[PDB]
Amino acid sequence: KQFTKCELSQLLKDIDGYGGIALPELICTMFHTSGYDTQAIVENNESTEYGLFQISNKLWCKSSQVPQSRNICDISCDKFLDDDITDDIMCAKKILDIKGIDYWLAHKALCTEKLEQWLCEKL
Ligand SMILES: [Ca+2]
Ligand SMILES: [Zn+2]
């Protein structure tokens, strides 16, 4: 599933301000991270990132590729490739709590300025 800017904004409205993070900033971050695609899979060296939030099997979810993973979100990585982003959001919040917004390189690089374009009026 590939969401549009406003569709996703509506789904994450209740997350505004979570961990001091503003909604438009999070939308911008996700645009440059996965392009709003729930099925994005990106192989890094000996690890892989999954889904809309690009959650890593190196530390956050369990995958057969990295059997030694701490699996902090306590969930198999396949759950981040389906149509329900509810469990993806639960894990992203745990990343925000523990590690913070810098888990996503896009935030500091491109998402602290030129923010009006990320606002949504109605879809
Ligand atoms: Ca999911
Ligand atoms: Zn990444």
Side-chain angles (χ1 to χ4, degrees), residues 79-88:
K79 301 303 289 195
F80 297 149
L81 300 178
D82 62 21
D83 283 3
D84 187 7
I85 65 169
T86 303
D87 53 7
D88 298 56

Side-chain angles (χ1 to χ4, degrees), residues 43-61:
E43 286 185 272
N44 286 272
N45 287 196
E46 70 298 89
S47 57
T48 299
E49 290 186 339
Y50 307 89
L52 177 74
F53 293 101
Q54 287 291 282
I55 297 166
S56 188
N57 62 1
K58 181 100 294 207
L59 190 56
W60 309 98
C61 58

Side-chain angles (χ1 to χ4, degrees), residues 28-75:
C28 173
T29 297
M30 290 329 138
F31 172 73
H32 297 292
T33 294
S34 63
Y36 312 138
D37 194 341
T38 62
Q39 301 178 342
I41 301 182
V42 182
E43 286 185 272
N44 286 272
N45 287 196
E46 70 298 89
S47 57
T48 299
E49 290 186 339
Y50 307 89
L52 177 74
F53 293 101
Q54 287 291 282
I55 297 166
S56 188
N57 62 1
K58 181 100 294 207
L59 190 56
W60 309 98
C61 58
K62 187 47 58 74
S63 162
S64 61
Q65 178 181 53
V66 185
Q68 70 272 37
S69 174
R70 287 181 159 124
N71 186 17
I72 297 168
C73 289
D74 196 43
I75 189 167

